[PDB]
């Protein structure tokens with residue numbers, strides 16, 4: 151039920167960043183990004199997510215201009231939301 155402009159698996163940057171719309175199907179544990187234990191990381195608590203863009207579970211991400219990610223997803227660029 152992904153929106154027409156959702157980040158897809160064929161997206162070059164999505165591939166490079168290991169993005170997945172479902173964090174439970176991601177390599178967050180292996181990346182071990184700092185800020186929060188790996189298993190707690192997803193788009194919803196990432197500094198780059200844009201809550202003012204998109205609707206419902208599909209919001210914006212500063213790193214994917216013009217597209218939408220899933221709040222329950224994850225990518226290697228995950229950064230703790232401090233703002």
Ligand code: SF4
Nearest residue numbers: 193196198199211225
């Ligand atoms: S940068 Fe953050 S909000 Fe954007 S896809 Fe990656 S984890 Fe999700």
